[PDB]
From a paper:
The [name] holoenzyme is a tetramer composed of two regulatory subunits (R) and two autoinhibited catalytic subunits (PKAc). The local action of [name] is dictated by A-kinase anchoring proteins (AKAPs) that impose spatial constraint by tethering this kinase in proximity to substrates. The D/D creates a high-affinity binding groove for a canonical amphipathic helix on each [name] that forms the reciprocal binding surface. Here we have used electron microscopy (EM) to evaluate the topological arrangement of the fully assembled type IIα [name] holoenzyme when anchored to [name]γ.
Class averages revealed a remarkable variety of configurations. These ranged from a tightly packed pseudo-symmetric triangular configuration to a fully extended linear configuration of the three densities. However, inspection of particles at various tilt angles showed that particles of linear and triangular conformations remained clearly distinguishable, even at high tilt angles. In both 3D reconstructions, a central mass with dimensions of 60 × 60 × 80 Å (corresponding to the site of [name]γ as demonstrated by affinity gold labeling, black triangle and Figure 1D, inset) was flanked on either side by larger densities of 100 × 100 × 85 Å. In the triangular conformation, the two peripheral densities are oriented at a 100° angle with respect to the central density and exhibit an end-to-end length of ∼300 Å (top). The end-to-end length increases to ∼385 Å in the extended linear configuration (bottom). Moreover, this back-projection analysis demonstrated that when the triangular model is tilted completely on its edge (where it may appear more linear in projection) its dimensions (max length = 300 Å) are significantly smaller than the maximum end-to-end length obtained for the linear reconstruction (max length = 385 Å). When [name]γ is docked to residues 1–43 of RIIα (RII(D/D)), the resulting sub-structure fits within the central density of maps for both the triangular and extended configurations (yellow). In a similar manner, the peripheral densities each accommodate a [name] sub-structure consisting of one catalytic subunit (blue) in complex with the cAMP-binding domain of RIIα, residues 91–392 (green). Finally these models were completed by connecting the central [name]γ–RII(D/D) sub-complex to each RIIα-PKAc unit through a flexible chain corresponding to residues 44–90 of RIIα (‘Materials and methods’).
Numbering used by the authors:
A (entry chain C), B (entry chain B): 9 to 111, 116 to 394
C (entry chain A): 88 to 317
D (entry chain E), E (entry chain D): 13 to 318, 332 to 350
Write the structure that this text describes.
Amino acid sequence: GLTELLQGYTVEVLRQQPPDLVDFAVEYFTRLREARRQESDTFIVSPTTFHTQESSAVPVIEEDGESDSDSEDADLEVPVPSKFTRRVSVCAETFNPDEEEEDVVHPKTDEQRCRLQEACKDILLFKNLDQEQLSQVLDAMFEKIVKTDEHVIDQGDDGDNFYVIERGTYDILVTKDNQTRSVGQYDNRGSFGELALMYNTPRAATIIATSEGSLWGLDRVTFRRIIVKNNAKKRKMFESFIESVPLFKSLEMSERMKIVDVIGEKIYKDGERIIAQGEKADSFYIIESGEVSILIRSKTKSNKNGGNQEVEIAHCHKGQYFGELALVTNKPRAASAYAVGDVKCLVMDVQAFERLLGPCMDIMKRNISHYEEQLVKMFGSN
Amino acid sequence: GLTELLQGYTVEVLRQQPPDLVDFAVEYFTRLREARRQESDTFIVSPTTFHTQESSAVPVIEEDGESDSDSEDADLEVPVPSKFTRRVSVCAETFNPDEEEEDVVHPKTDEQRCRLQEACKDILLFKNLDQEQLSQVLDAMFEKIVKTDEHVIDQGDDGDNFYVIERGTYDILVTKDNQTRSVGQYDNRGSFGELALMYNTPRAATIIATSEGSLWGLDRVTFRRIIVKNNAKKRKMFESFIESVPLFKSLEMSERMKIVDVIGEKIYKDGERIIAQGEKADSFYIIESGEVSILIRSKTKSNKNGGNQEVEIAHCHKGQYFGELALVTNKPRAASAYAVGDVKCLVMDVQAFERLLGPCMDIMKRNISHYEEQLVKMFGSN
Amino acid sequence: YQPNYFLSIPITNKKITAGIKVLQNSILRQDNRLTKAMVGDGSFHITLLVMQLLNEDEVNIGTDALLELKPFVEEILEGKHLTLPFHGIGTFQGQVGFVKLADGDHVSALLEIAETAKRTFQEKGILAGESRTFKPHLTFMKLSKAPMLWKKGVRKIEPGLYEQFIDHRFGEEILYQIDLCSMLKKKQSNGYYHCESSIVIGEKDRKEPEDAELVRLSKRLVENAVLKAV
Amino acid sequence: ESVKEFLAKAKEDFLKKWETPSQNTAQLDQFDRIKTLGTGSFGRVMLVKHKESGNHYAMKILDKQKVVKLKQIEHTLNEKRILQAVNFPFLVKLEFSFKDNSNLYMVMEYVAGGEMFSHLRRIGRFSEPHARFYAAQIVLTFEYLHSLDLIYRDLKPENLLIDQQGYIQVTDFGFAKRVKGRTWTLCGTPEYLAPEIILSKGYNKAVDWWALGVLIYEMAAGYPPFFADQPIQIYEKIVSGKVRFPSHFSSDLKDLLRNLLQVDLTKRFGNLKNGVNDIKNHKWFATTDWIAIYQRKVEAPFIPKFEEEIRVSINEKCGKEFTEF
Amino acid sequence: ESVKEFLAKAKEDFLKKWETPSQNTAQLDQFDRIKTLGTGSFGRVMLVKHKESGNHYAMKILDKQKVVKLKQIEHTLNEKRILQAVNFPFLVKLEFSFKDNSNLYMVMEYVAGGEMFSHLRRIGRFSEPHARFYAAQIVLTFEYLHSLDLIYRDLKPENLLIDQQGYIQVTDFGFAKRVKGRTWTLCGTPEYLAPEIILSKGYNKAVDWWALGVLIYEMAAGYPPFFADQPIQIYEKIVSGKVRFPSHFSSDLKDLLRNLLQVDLTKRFGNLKNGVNDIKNHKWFATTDWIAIYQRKVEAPFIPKFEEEIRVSINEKCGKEFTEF
């Protein structure tokens, strides 16, 4: 502003040629000095927008994409598998049945032994054993003392013995899957583990003593050996009594064994009747000990009457046989037979004999050079 | 002053940085505006005066010269020849002597005139002047009054007048060479300057009045004219009385003038004797006025005796002459002559007459036809 | 390259050239053997643009380019005179002595004119201008002009020689004439460079042909008073 | 009849091989190796192929040393002697036998067929005609075996294979034993044990016939005649001999079975006077052509569906006892 | 006698030239100019030479205008008329006269001789014989002049020149005047004035003779008879006529002088009956041969020793009065 301010003054000085420049300056700027403005403008402007149109452009590209998608889904496991894989054979320990050569001592009072017998009556392996074998078996039973809280047998464990309770109380437990149930108790009575006498197999339950007690035990091997040995001895003995009987000489080994398999034994006290005259002849006997008296009441000798008493036709001993006619005929017994003292006979049923070997008459003829002899023996005089 | 004004404001705007340049200008120029003090001056007189134009171009010139110098002592050189020492002629003013035709009045009392005569007795020019001329001369003397301290005459000055003192005292001075001497005084008596009446010549002394005085003066020209005129008139008159005398008719003009030059005059009072009978005859007379009686005492007529008385032989008048015989003889006078009334005669000496013209007898004979007549007149009867 | 031609702004303000004459003479009274180093009377100028004109056609082309430049310089000045104030003295390494161009708005305008000049000439095929910065100055002496000076011990301009003119205002030149000058041809009678052609910037020069008249002068008087107060 | 001919020639052929076992026959380098199906719970049986002939066989790997433990080492040394001496159409075959430091390798024949146990269990039970078909094969096999005084002792679905021809092939002679007289080992399978075995009375050929009765019953019923959850009860039932037959069992079948499952040896079929003819001539087998079944000419009712690297010891070990092999 | 002849012829010659003055005779261009001795205290006299004849003359320059002042202008116009009309051997000569705007120029003869005044004063006084010689010349000159009724009136040593022949030549006719009758101007030289002049009685020829007496006395004595320091005393002595003669004066001289210096005109020589013969026949002049002196044949007793450029007015001035010249 300085140059323009002073230019207005200087224009007027040049135009007006005043004689006193300073006085002219006082007047000029004083008149300028009032500085009144006739008009002034103050303005506010709204925003203003200008519109343009933009230029075009061209873009060129081609793109191709290839992909393949697959999905899978899953399910609950059930149903579970159903099938069961296998079954199995069993086998006990082998043993030479035929007696090796004589080569178990556990004391027992009468009451104890008597009680063991009772406890064993119903066990199938014992149920039908003869007097002797049962004795040898009880002899072999060893005692086992048990203190309270002790496990006699534990489920799953291998088994070798059978036990009879002598004294004490016991709890029986059975685990099925993950559960164990105290199923029952024994109070000074009982037996268990019979299966162990057959073959080795897992114990099916656990038995724990709940007091001081005593049990009689029996080991499988000992039990099997006692029994087999005895039955194999009996067989050899039966075999001999059949073999020495001439009527059966034409029999083959295997045929004698079929007899041995089924033939019976009977004990008779002196004087008791074995065969009664008149009843039906179903079997024959072979004396293995003692003697037998054969009597006939002499009446069936004529036409009505007579003797009607007692007459001894024959008298047999160890190794002999009687009742043979039941094998070749079907008429009532001709005479009665009584035990002369203590007797033991092998008893064979005729019908069983025939089913096994066929009729006796054919056997007698097998060996033709002895057929006559045999015939005279069976239907002859003496 | 415009740029300086704008600059000074701008310098203060730059220093002070005023936000409002217009208010700053009002204040700046107002403060500046009084602006004391503009000027100081001294006013004095030029002093203004008229002057010749101040400036000229100056010419340049070259010149050379030569000189003669004379050096001398200085002297008055008052006295220088003066070689002559030669006598110079003098001359008065000329004048027609013969009376022009009647064509000076200064009053004087008897005592004054009488005193002038006395003062003039011895002056040579006046000494032997007749009664008439002296009178005419005194008549012509004019009065000159002088105041004390005044110079009557000054040595050296030209002279024209002669002076007679009437009254007063005077000092006489004479300068010889460089010296002036108060040589003498006059006390109411005196005269001086006589030479001036002859010709013009330098005054030989200076006369100064020492009191109020009076002097009678006479101018040369007036004095000479009075005298010449009168003597020339007298001459003409004498000439006439000689001319009318028949005895002298044969005389030439120049011869009559020689007589006129020397002839005398005499006045006789009535009755007085002019010529006495018996004395020697030396001259002759010519009456110019009056009458003369000629007497003779009749005794010289015989031989001793007689008359011895008085007898008148002749009686002459104006123009006549007597005593003529003295011119032709040498005997005593024959008769006496007496003046009859107042007489004036011209008297001529015979001896002078002869020396001048020779003997009278020869003159009488000059004119021969009148010789006889003349002779009878001189020695004749009447 | 070596130029042989230039655009010249002649110094026409007699006060400037008279002041330089005084400067030159004062130096010479101190050391008279600097005589031939002084630039000649009548030669004073500002160089606006250097160039090469190497034949008759190119000399004509230069003249054409100068004519074409005129309207451009008029455009640049935007109705105001270009005033060049010359104040003080400088040297280029003690070998060239010059009156300085005072700083101000005029320097940028002058530079703009120089660059537009360079472009105009090059577009007509003339090698013109330089790569170095345009630094206008008014030369008054050059030692190279007097080769014998080296040869006798004077190898720089003594700064003391021009001490009294160090802040001397020489004067102001208003741009008007622009001359196309030959560096190598014989100088004119008046001392100036040989001139092929000239243009005049001025209208001459006013926004309006008609007289204001003299109204503008108030602007000149005020602007000058303000410059003097600084 | 030819029956006698066959058996006579049979006993001859058998006694010859029995009294002179064919030891170490083929060489291990003649057979390669394929799959290895022979795990289970004992023994190492792996499939194998032949060289020149290029046949398939089932080789049982029995480490000479592996023996000595277990249950027995004779029930095998004996088993081998029998397999080698016998020859029947419904019996598996010991093709090649050999040993040496490896020792005792059994090269059994191979039939890519199915198990009898799996088939029977799937379908539940066989129709009587179909059951009679398999039964006939076992009767004939037992007649042959007993002719040589050999008892099988382990009859059961599990030990019977159905070959690709649909005929039975008997396997596993673990309990097979030559016995003239009586024997006593308590062995077999619970369900199939004879009363005499359970009770140790001594026995021989009769147990095989009892087992047959059990086998026939299970085939026609789907389950064995003396089944029970506890082994003890099975035996008590076996000993009582009491049997209950399904409603659908025919009369002829029930009768035959009452005679096979006889606890009384005097009444058991096969053990009586006529032996195996009491069985062959039974009304249940009337529509059976015994020769036809023998020659495998009858049309079976069902055609079945169809590892590591061990080494020797470079030295023979237990060969100081397994000589006979 | 010839005396009468001479004078008669003389008067004739004179009256002729007197009644018809020879005016403007020669021309100024016939005479040149030499020295210029003519100052003193009046007039301008300059020497001059002639053309054809080439003679020397003394020309008096009288400016026609210069006149009119001074003392008189007739004592000259008259002087000229006389010089021209007279002719005598002991008288200077007016050779040529002329005028015109210059006007009045006197061409007097020239004798390169000496002045009488200078000669007499130097030697003091002349011897009587020598004095008688000069005297005779003056007597003769006066007889001639008086014959023409002309009186000189200025006799004195100063106005007498001694020519180269030793004879007298009279100059300066300033006071010369023709008078028949009587005249009256008081003029001359103090020492030489006659009583009648001093006293104004009128006079004529007698004064010249008185002057001669004075002139003769001074020559023989050295000083004039009535000398005195004051003019007044000179005249009083002159009037008294008393004279005292030096001791050396001879008798004849004293007598002659008593007769010349006669105050009484009836007794003065020259004025009496015989005129100039009373003088010529005096005993003092007895040894004088008058004719001889006239013809200048006698031997004189003493032979004497032997500027600017003016112009006319180109116009005649005072010629309106100086006609007669």
